[PDB]
Symmetry: C3
């Protein structure tokens, strides 16, 4: 069965089908970019197709087994995997899962997706992904620590951990304290002469070189991606909406890190979050749900169920089919497939999760003509941008703003004082020129996270605009996914084009 008609396809097959759509569009452009007076047009097309043939498969996978000592004294053997999809830029970049679902095929497929997401936000890393096949809840903190230090050593001995070769990150089942342990193990062993050891991994605690602004970054990028598309009347009218985020109604599938922080930013932006659907229960409220109260309730009772500021909802798994302006898939992959795509009524889908829409569903919804999907490899890449800033920070050996906050603040005050002196000379009375309420608040709370926030907002706007320009140039309509892959493929291809692919 062709991919556009399958029901539960493999994740790696989805990535490659979407890759092919983008490659077909951008191929003539790639041929034109190959400047060579020695090659005919036929020769150029054969080399371009060779380059694309090398990009799609994963370059490298390392598989390891190793014993650990349980706390009571018996020993167990643990499996782990680390995939490096592309080395066209080094180091490679990607997270590490502790989960019973990790396997070779899964670290392969998500490492491919990660190469394209790095290219999408102009982050100079090839894609990587890793995993340890354990249920982290069945282990004590002491056992988790021994497992974590051992994967650091074994990965680093073979070139799958280090600031210049491969730089990991947190994922499901790991967090910042595991990242601190890996950084400490690397610095004391394999990396003991490395001047930049703390740059071997990102997601670290602040005290160990982590960066302010990381926790909310993926959510802040989902908000900024919607804002780039909500300001465009040509697209908002085709789908039956008015410009802007204030007033729009939002249903969110998932209340993890990504769902909760996206709710905070969309609420602050003036949107109405009318529905939260979880794995065992759903809630709703057509007037909107207040983020701080909902998070507080779940924090105390253990669930979003019976939230006083909303009502529980009928067969909880069907909330995502209700009418809304924006649906945010923020849970598991393939949550939208062939058998339920038609039941979707949202006008905008913002993929805050890895591949939540299969190619069959993506096609059913493109044919319906009234639904704009903002692709995952762009819109949930905010955290990838800020992990690039954390690596930079560890290479700079100083926090952002340490040598500029006071210098720039004093220049700004001398600027306003110069304006005040000239104004008073001109109108001949006293006339204070001070920072207004908003400017005084920024000046007073100036910190590293503001530089990080501005860096992320800059990248998402630039990349979002480039997707739109590509979609208009090739008459792609509302198919922004194909436009995003074409921009991503084009960047990777140009590395191979200038590095030299003549050898083989």
């Amino acid at each position: 069965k062709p991919m556009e008609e399958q029901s539960n396809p493999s994740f790696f097959k989805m990535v490659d089908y979407y890759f092919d759509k983008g490659a077909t569009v951008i191929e003539p452009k790639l041929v034109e970019e190959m400047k060579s007076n020695s090659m005919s047009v036929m020769d150029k097309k054969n080399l371009v197709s060779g380059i694309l043939k090398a990009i799609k498969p994963v370059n490298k996978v390392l598989y390891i087994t190793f014993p650990i000592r349980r706390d009571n004294g018996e020993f167990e053997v643990v499996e782990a995997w680390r995939a490096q999809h592309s080395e066209h830029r080094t180091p490679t970049k990607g997270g590490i899962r502790y989960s019973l679902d990790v396997c070779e095929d899964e670290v392969k497929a998500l490492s491919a997706l990660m190469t394209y997401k790095c290219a999408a936000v102009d982050v100079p890393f090839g894609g990587a992904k890793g995993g340890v096949k354990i249920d982290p809840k069945m282990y004590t903190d002491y056992e988790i620590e021994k497992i974590t230090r051992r994967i650091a050593i074994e990965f680093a001995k073979k070139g799958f951990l280090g600031p210049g070769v491969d730089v990991p990150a947190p994922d499901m089942g790991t967090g910042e304290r595991e990242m601190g342990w890996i950084a400490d193990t690397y610095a004391q062993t394999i990396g003991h002469l490395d001047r930049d050891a703390s740059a071997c991994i990102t997601g670290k605690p602040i005290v160990a070189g982590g960066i302010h602004g990381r926790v909310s970054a993926t959510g802040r990028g989902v908000w900024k991606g919607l804002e780039v598309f909500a300001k465009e009347p040509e697209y908002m009218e085709k789908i039956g909406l008015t410009p802007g985020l204030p007033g729009k109604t939002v249903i969110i599938q998932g209340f993890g890190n990504v769902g909760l922080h996206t709710m905070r930013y969309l609420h602050r932006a003036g949107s109405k979050v009318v529905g939260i659907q979880e794995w065992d229960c759903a809630i709703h409220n057509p007037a909107g749900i207040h983020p701080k109260e909902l998070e507080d309730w779940r924090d105390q009772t253990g669930s979003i169920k019976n939230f006083p500021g909303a009502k529980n909802f009928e067969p909880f798994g069907d909330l995502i089919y209700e009418a809304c302006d924006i649906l945010v898939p923020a849970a598991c992959e393939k949550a939208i497939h062939k058998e339920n795509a038609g039941r979707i009524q949202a006008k905008i889908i913002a993929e805050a999760a890895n591949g939540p829409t299969t190619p069959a569903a993506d096609k059913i919804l493109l044919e319906r003509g009234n639904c704009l999907i903002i692709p995952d490899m762009y819109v949930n890449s905010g955290g990838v941008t800020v992990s690039y800033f954390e690596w930079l920070k560890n290479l700079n050996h100083v926090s952002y703003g340490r040598l500029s906050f006071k210098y720039e603040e004093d220049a700004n005050l001398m600027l306003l004082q110069s304006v005040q002196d000239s104004l008073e000379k001109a109108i001949g009375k006293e006339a204070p020129v001070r920072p207004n309420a908003q400017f005084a608040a920024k000046i007073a709370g100036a910190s590293e996270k503001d530089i990080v926030h501005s860096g992320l907002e800059y990248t998402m706007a630039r990349s979002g605009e480039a997707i739109i320009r590509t979609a208009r140039k090739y008459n792609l309509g509302l198919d922004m996914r194909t436009a995003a892959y074409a921009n991503s493929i084009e960047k990777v291809y140009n590395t191979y084009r200038t590095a030299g692919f003549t050898f083989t």
Copy 2:
């Protein structure tokens, strides 16, 4: 005899007694910061006390002997020492003395103090200290050079010199030309493949990678530390003073680098420096002494004695007991002890020297209730901040401001021109909008030292405010030393907490 009643205690014992006072205050906070669902409160308190037990002793000392050839042809054996107190962050940092008083115990005690001073100004280095046991005046420039190159090689072979491991600095009996020699020896030998060789040491001549603004930096930090405390009415009233530095009278013990530059900044700030006490003579003048004339006189005659702009003073060693608002100990250690603390009449003591106040004297003066001591590990750490900027500069391989002075100047002129255009449109006449006299002077003299000055001022204000907040939170009164150690201990402890102390 308990430490609060001894008369001449060892310097290392003073540092550890002050360490214990701070540790006692902050210990409950450290327990609360240990997030672990696996440990009971009892377990956390036992691990916290283990961490503090490892922080206090010096981790490493290297001792060396080596021959040198005198100029006439005979040979002599020279001793030297280098201590690394803490490696919780690398490289370690600290100066090198050429003096007949260097010994193992002295490089040990001052290396401990140096760990806490680095933490106090948020500088990411463990503490180190070094020394060569010679009287530098008895040697020719050729012999000093041979000794200096030899300690470079021997220290660097064992990991006690290098940009990522241990970064020295000038001290008594050494200066910038010895630092240039060490940097050149390292780059041509042990460090011949090191891309960042010039970052192995700080205090270098400008042409070799030194930084503008280093000479006056420790004095500029003493001034900024007094200014943080002089603006606080709650404390100025408890000691019988009015806010601010203009008008306050100042007596300074010592006319070396630190005393002279502190006099320059305090005079420029509007204070009256009524007394200078040296090792063999003192002078005074209740109207104030002009810094540039005094420095000129000593430069020509060889001493501050018989300065025309002041009178010589009765038993010169007793000037520091005269009434004043501010006393600045800037000479030897333990200048204030049990037998002379009561004779001190100053309301503020700004410790511009390493441990000038013993624990007995510190306690006699805390009980008198009317005397505010600003602790040495904070207030004479301005030079430590700027040595961190010099290391950064050598890692960046470019001077600060090289790629921004003209870009930012042109943006500021386009900003003022935009304001001028809008003002003239609004009021309908010609109305120049130019930088005022102060802003035009800064724009015209913009240079690396202005970035350095602002960086230092930023750090001293932030750290000074954090000392005050900690002193108010734990009801410490005027005991700012204990508050400063508690902030310093807390930073070091959090490195150990996240790095992992489970092994042992």
Copy 3:
């Protein structure tokens, strides 16, 4: 025959004669800068003369031969050379020529010139130069690629290629695609563990780490060098000219990269380019030639001959003797010699080429009293400044402005909004305060090249002013070349002075 009377002297002899003139002027200053209480004035003068004796000769030359396989299957032996003139700062810096005229003597002489040009624009590299003895037009792209990868490996094995040791650049017969190949070969072989591999060479394609603003940089520096001298009335009056570039007539010898970009900047500055003289034809027009049309015509027909916007000129090789305010030699070396210096009527000569004026001609024109030569080692060093920025960029691992364009733009808008609020409060009506037309255009097109442009303009003004100050201090008149060598010698000497030259 003395150098000031020779007719066709060797290029290395010209550089050393000019070196001696500068050394003679600055020698007393160098003696005074040697602070040492151990040496007499006689001793200092002997050591200074030793240092200058070591600076002039080339420190190192590497010569290599190697086989290559032609495309048809036969083999050929190729020669190449790489000279490192000075290692007082590392890495060394300089381009690589593919040309049948490369030889040991030529890479030696231009490597010496390159040390002095780096010092002239405050760029911290010793001088290097390289070459491959081939006619690049006789080879296919495949053969050029094999030659290029082989010189990368062989140079890098011996320390003549690498980010910390020696950093090359394009020159006659090479361009950005060869630079990409060298960077890729180094990163995959000798440099496979080097975290900063892409910094081994400059002139790279953008996608591989090249820098925006490189193509026009040497021309932009010729324009800025003329502007520094055209604003000075003392000199413009001695040569019979009025201040400024608007209105001045310009004849340019050469229409390569340097000549064409200089024409663009001088035209945009308001100058009239009345003549272009090439190797086989010349054109002229006393009303001026439009750059974009001329470049278009040559692009289509293959030559500047029969340009519709001008007339062809009588014995084409004599256009450079016609009256003009500014002559720009931008072709081959020694284009002005003893037998044709008198025929030169230009009031300003801006040497946009390596040594276009021999010492005999330089002296004939200094005696005529009415001709100001702006020396090549200063005025055609704009590209050297920007190659330093490209190396910095590869060490920073991020493009300039990536983490500041949006942060600074938002601060500027909050600044203007604060001014608007205060203005409206003061005059009691609505009064917009917006960026004017020029400021809005800069804000909207803000990019890396603007930082690069400002960096270059800053350096050329500072170095141009230092040449003028030195020429006035030693009564050098219009002899700016001697003043420029003296500033360059002084910088190199101070490295040797502080590094230590006592050994030998």
